[PDB]
Amino acid sequence: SGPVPSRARVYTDVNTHRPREYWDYESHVVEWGNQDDYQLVRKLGRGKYSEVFEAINITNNEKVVVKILKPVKKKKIKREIKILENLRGGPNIITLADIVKDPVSRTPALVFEHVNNTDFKQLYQTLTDYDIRFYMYEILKALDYCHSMGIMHRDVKPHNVMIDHEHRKLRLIDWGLAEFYHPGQEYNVRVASRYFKGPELLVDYQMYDYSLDMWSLGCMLASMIFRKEPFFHGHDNYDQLVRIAKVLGTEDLYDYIDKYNIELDPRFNDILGRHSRKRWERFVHSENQHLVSPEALDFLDKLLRYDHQSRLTAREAMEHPYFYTVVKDQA
Ligand SMILES: N#Cc1cnn2c(NC3CC3)cc(-c3sccc3-c3ccc(=O)[nH]c3)nc12
């Protein structure tokens, strides 16, 4: 027997109610700017599918970030562009400023708003309890917005969170893995970095939704309050599920597998073993106790659930007691 179908608990049919053009990115026609408006200043990074640079827009003297793409399927470039344009002006969503192509090389490049980022491997270790709640609330604004717009980011991790700590400015970036949610659609499970992959990805459950981003957000929160990066440190995708089972327990995992009639890869049987559900206190010590509170733990618990349907939505998460003071100060 095949797996049991699943539907998003919230924003289920937002794309169905939209005109086709909104989500049918394959038919999207790219609007190109002028490549001569931009001059590369310095390199910021290299990736598997791109090279990133800092640039100057010589028409207005503004600092920008330029992502020059390596060979990528045109439908995937159209997907990222279409999502970026649909999300433009949304809270804490990076702004796509321009799309340019080299006239000779035919190489496409995405031009973004620049964020004066403080690298997370330096910033996070300085963040107070209030900073973690404030920045977690800001990512949640970006997530509730993109989910309400029928989009799952699918790559939520510290590297995709740009923070200008001086101006308390956060942007959720790199929409290259993002997809439109369609009820009944089977998605590719080979998405996200190892440490942030949800149980649905690791067990090969394809009918997932926005709730995937909520697991990732839970992984980030656990690493920040416990000062343990990564929180679930698997040696591969199979061992990644073992690392989660050693914390959440194997009982709720097999209850999750049984509920959705998931065919578990035979490799898993001999590595998963039998594990009890641990108490969050075993990750608490003298150097992280100032970031850990009963509110933080309660919130974290409600994010990290094997059953995607039982995790908090981004809007429910914003309503949690953990954010009461952030909500108060913002009024
Ligand atoms: N989008 C965007 C964006 C805004 N600011 N910003 C900064 N700012 C620091 C230099 C101060 C760095 C990067 C970097 S650094 C290495 C890779 C990337 C990158 C850029 C685009 C993308 O889609 N993924 C990854 N991206 C951005």
Curated annotation (Swiss-Prot):
Q: What is its main location?
A: nucleus
Full-sequence portion shown in this chain: 2 to 332 of 391
Q: What's known about how it's activated or inhibited?
A: Constitutively active protein kinase whose activity is not directly affected by phosphorylation. Seems to be regulated by level of expression and localization.
The name on file for this protein is Casein kinase II subunit alpha
Residue intervals of the Protein kinase domain? 38-323
* Active site annotation, chain numbering: D155 (proton acceptor)
Q: Report the subcellular localization.
A: Nucleus
- What miscellaneous comment appears in this entry? Can use both ATP and GTP as phosphoryl donors. Phosphorylation by casein kinase 2 has been estimated to represent up to one quarter of the eukaryotic phosphoproteome. Casein kinase 2 has been found to be increased at protein level and up-regulated at the level of enzyme activity in the majority of cancers. However, elevated levels of casein kinase 2 are present in certain normal organs such as brain and testes.
Give the encoding gene's name. Answer: CSNK2A1
- Similarity comment: Belongs to the protein kinase superfamily. Ser/Thr protein kinase family. CK2 subfamily.
Q: Give the highest taxon in the source lineage.
A: Eukaryota
